[PDB]
RNA sequence: CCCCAUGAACGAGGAAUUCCCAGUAAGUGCGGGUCAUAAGCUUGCGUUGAUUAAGUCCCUGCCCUUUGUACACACCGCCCG
RNA sequence: CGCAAGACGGACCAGAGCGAAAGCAUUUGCCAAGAAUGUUUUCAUUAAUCAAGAACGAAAGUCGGAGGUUCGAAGACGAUCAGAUACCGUCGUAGUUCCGACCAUAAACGAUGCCGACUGGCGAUGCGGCGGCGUUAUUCCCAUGACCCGCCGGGCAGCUUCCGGGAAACCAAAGUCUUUGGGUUCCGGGGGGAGUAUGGUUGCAAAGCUGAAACUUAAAGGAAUUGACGGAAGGGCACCACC
């Protein structure tokens, strides 16, 4: 029986996102009003916004994403902070090319603040110019020694440092570089990302990092 | 109705998601977090037949019903998530999913970013109705 | 009498290998036996990215593709003139071709 | 969602198509603006110079 | 289309242009009674069929060399152009610019020659 | 054959299906064959004269490669309980 | 958006690897094991191949649990058909998965015994060793490392070849077979009756091994060749075909 068409009813919030990021106004959200029998932050909280970050840097971050998610809220402001990183499909699918090596290695770290995360790396070995071999495998020996130096850096570089300075770290892709330096006495490799992050324990609250990190 | 803000410039941010199987087309767009809808209408509901639930032009007609609202309740813009049936299902787009994107962009709402979404499995459970295939 | 030397697809050094299921009667094949083919191809496709690209903010941005590698077994693949029978004398090339790479004005 | 009426003239015939061998191809210069340029399939018998009368204005088919 | 001529026609005109070309002409009219003169052909409606094609060959001919017919004065003119030959390329100007190897090519030949080095890298198969 | 009278069904044809591209389809009369007599026939001929593809291999039919075949009185053929 | 269960290890992944074969792709650690190579180490004939005996042995099935996510031998359903107990849709079973026992069979095909020698070209690739006043990658030079080129073993193979083989298809082994003789082991003697009867044996069971006859019958069969013909592929052609 006709009722309650709900847009006409809907309220608006701007979603903000961290201080590393550049520009930071990153779209807008509706939520219902709020009525005592209910928080429209409830509602509003610990939503997930997946958010490209080539609108978050501006680019060559075609490929990569990041997702941030709602931590808290103040008027038609809602403050989010770093949920993951992951790489789309058609980057991904791309890299996957036959006659070469796929080698993954990912490794699980506590920050400096508590945060716990797991954390992947990727590389694909290359053919070098003059090489007249079609394929350019690796040796067994090889990937395993790659991804010990691979697994070595990423907890080594993430041990030191809290959320954000990964965060500051993720988007020269200094990682990357590292691993490319640490590795090419070993064995050639193209491409090399650290490809996603995965947030798997949350420290207690703190509005205070939160607001240092936004504000 | 109603509108985020006036924005003579940027436009107010939802998400598109389009599931294109064969015998149907679902549109799509919901608040960025997603835990809010907004407008759907399918391939379907536009046109009888169930033979014809997935035919593109179908597809338009639902692309068209939901840009519709899209920009009569507040989207002015939206970023696409197109999709497959996926599982171990077929992994190839269904037939009216370039349609309902054509639609809406030709509609004259706003375009950003895409990826696909269809959930493909690091493989298993088997494969439905058995070994000798379906047999047609 | 034996037709084809390598008998299906290529084994000789196993004796066995996991099958992989057909991406259209969902059959069942083993992975040496089996046509495959890759599938890249971008989102939006022929027409659309002039409207996709005007109705879009991002200045220029730049096109994702969807990469799908399918399977098929021996009856679909024919079916479907994904592969076609080849004289007795033509069906020993391996070899890959066409003339131009078609990717827009092609056939 | 739509409507138009589409003015556009054959460029370019094709060739046959339809098993029976009854629709034309044809190319299409866009009449109001030549900054365009179509493939259509026809019923008639179609000569270059003629004016087709488009519905869809996209579409731009193939085979059949 | 439907006409295609066949080989006694064709065969007739070949025949006749290696015998006839000086005395042939651009103009079916004439070859025509030339026809009459230089050959037997039984039907009125075959000598025609023949000197037309015999007249589409000449006016073909007469425009460029066609693939499988020869005449006295073609040779002649092939021979004359088949002479040319410069200042003369090569040269190949002061000094032969080797790949050295070929340097080592002549230097253990016992070969004294002009020079020039720049020969390095490998080298890739495919 | 005529003259009168009696003055039927049939008011557009389902499943199907023939034939056809230019003086062609179709209307329309004539003459020849049969013939003593007997034209609703066949077999031409002129007259009046369009609509419509202008192509293609879908169905059908037949021959073109390649291919499969336990067929070869050849698919209107020769396989299991 | 989170979470639980059970399943499975995609893309990368190949005429590529290993393993006696059956078979075997997530990380990491432990445990022993296996080939190749290198090797102026050790023994001095230790050795080749095999009745009997024995180890392993995909799948289904069977015994008892765990477990059943997924899919699903049976059944019940909806359609289709002249008939439909089917294919096709749906619901859905034992079962799939895992543990401890059975069972001993698969076009378990390379349909090709195993071992040794000899007879023919080229380029790949896994791997080991060896060589280069070759490339690129670094520091102050390096030790590195990956490559290019060559050489040699032993892998799985490929390619081209009037050696030669074979009925041919094919085959560098199916060669070195009437010029018939390197070692050893196994099975077959027209086709059906028949892996059947019967006794023995193994099995909880389902079944497995060994394995006849009476009778029946003049071809069974192989290979190549060619048509005919196809609801196989590129094919065409004609209003006796369509449009």
Redesign the pocket.
Same mark, same amino acid.
């Given at each position: 029986k006709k009722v309650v068409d709900p847009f006409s009813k809907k309220d608006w919030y701007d979603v903000k996102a961290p201080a590393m990021f550049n520009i930071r106004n990153i779209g807008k959200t509706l939520v219902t009003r709020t009525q005592g029998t209910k928080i429209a932050s409830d509602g509003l909280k610990?939503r997930?916004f997946?958010v490209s970050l080539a609108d978050l840097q501006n680019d060559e971050v075609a490929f990569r994403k990041f997702?941030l998610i709602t931590e808290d809220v103040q008027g038609k402001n809602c403050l989010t902070n770093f949920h993951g990183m992951d790489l789309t499909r058609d980057k991904?699918?791309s890299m996957?090319?036959?006659?070469? #090596?796929?080698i993954?290695?990912h490794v699980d770290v506590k920050t400096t603040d508590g945060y716990l995360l797991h954390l992947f790396c990727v590389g694909?070995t290359k053919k070098?110019?003059?090489?007249?071999?079609? #394929?350019? +495998?690796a040796?067994?020996?090889?990937?395993?020694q790659i991804?010990?130096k691979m697994m070595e850096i990423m907890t080594r570089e993430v041990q030191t440092n809290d959320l954000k300075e990964v965060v500051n770290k993720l988007i020269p892709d200094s990682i990357g570089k590292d691993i490319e330096k640490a590795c090419?006495?070993? +064995?050639?490799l193209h491409d090399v990302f650290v490809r996603k992050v995965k947030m798997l324990k949350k420290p207690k609250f703190e509005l205070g990092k939160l607001m240092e990190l936004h504000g | 109705s109603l509108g985020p803000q006036v924005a003579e410039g940027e436009n107010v941010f939802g998400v598109c998601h389009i599931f294109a199987s064969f015998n149907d087309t679902f549109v799509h767009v919901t608040d960025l977090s997603?835990?809010e809808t907004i407008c759907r209408v399918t391939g379907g509901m536009k046109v009888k037949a169930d033979r014809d639930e997935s035919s593109p032009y179908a597809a338009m007609l639902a692309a068209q019903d939901v840009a519709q609202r899209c920009k009569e309740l507040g989207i002015t813009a939206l970023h696409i998530k197109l999709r497959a049936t996926g599982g171990?299902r077929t992994k190839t787009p269904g037939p009216g999913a370039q349609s309902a994107l054509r639609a809406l962009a030709r509609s004259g709402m706003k375009i950003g970013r895409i990826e696909d979404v269809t959930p493909?499995?690091?493989?298993?459970?088997?494969?439905?109705?058995?070994r000798?295939?379906?047999?047609? | 009498? $034996?037709?084809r030397?390598?008998?299906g697809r290529?084994?000789?050094?196993?004796?066995?290998?996991?099958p992989?299921r057909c991406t259209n009667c969902a059959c069942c094949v083993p992975?040496?036996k089996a046509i495959?083919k890759?599938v890249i191809r971008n989102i939006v496709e022929a027409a659309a990215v002039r409207d996709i690209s005007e109705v879009s903010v991002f200045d220029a941005y730049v096109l994702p593709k969807l990469?799908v $590698?399918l399977h098929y077994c021996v009856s679909c693949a024919?079916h479907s $003139?994904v592969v *076609?029978? *080849?004289? *007795?004398?033509?069906r020993?090339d391996?070899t890959p071709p066409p003339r131009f790479r078609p990717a827009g004005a092609a056939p | 969602r739509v409507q138009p009426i589409k003015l556009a003239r054959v460029t370019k015939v094709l060739?046959?198509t339809?098993? &029976?061998? &009854?629709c034309?191809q044809v190319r299409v210069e866009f009449m109001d603006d030549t900054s365009r340029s179509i493939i259509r399939n026809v019923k008639?018998?179609v000569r270059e110079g003629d004016v087709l009368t488009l519905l869809e204005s996209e579409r731009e088919a193939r085979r059949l | 289309m439907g006409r295609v001529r066949t080989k006694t026609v064709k065969k007739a005109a070949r025949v006749i242009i290696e015998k006839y070309y000086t005395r042939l002409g651009n103009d079916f009219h004439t070859n025509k009674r030339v026809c009459e003169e230089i050959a037997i052909i039984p039907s009125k409606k075959l000598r025609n069929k023949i000197a037309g094609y015999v007249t589409h060959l000449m006016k073909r001919i007469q425009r460029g060399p066609v693939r499988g017919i020869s005449i006295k004065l073609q040779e002649e003119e092939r021979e004359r152009r088949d002479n040319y030959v410069p200042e003369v390329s090569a040269l190949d100007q002061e000094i032969i610019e080797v790949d050295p190897d070929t340097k080592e090519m002549l230097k253990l030949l016992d070969f004294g020659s002009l020079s020039n080095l720049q020969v390095?890298?490998?080298?890739?198969?495919m």
């Open positions: 610990g997930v997946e997702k991904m699918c996957v090319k036959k006659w070469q #090596t796929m993954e290695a694909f070098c110019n003059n090489q007249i071999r079609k #394929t350019s +495998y040796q067994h020996q090889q990937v395993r991804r010990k090419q006495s070993i +064995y050639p | 997603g835990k171990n493909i499995p690091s493989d298993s459970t088997r494969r439905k109705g058995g000798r295939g379906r047999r047609l | 009498t $034996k037709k030397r390598n008998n290529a084994k000789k050094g196993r004796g066995h290998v996991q992989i992975k040496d495959k890759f990469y $590698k024919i $003139k *076609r029978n *080849r004289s *007795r004398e033509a020993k391996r | 060739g046959r339809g098993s &029976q061998g &009854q034309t008639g018998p | 390095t890298q490998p080298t890739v198969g």
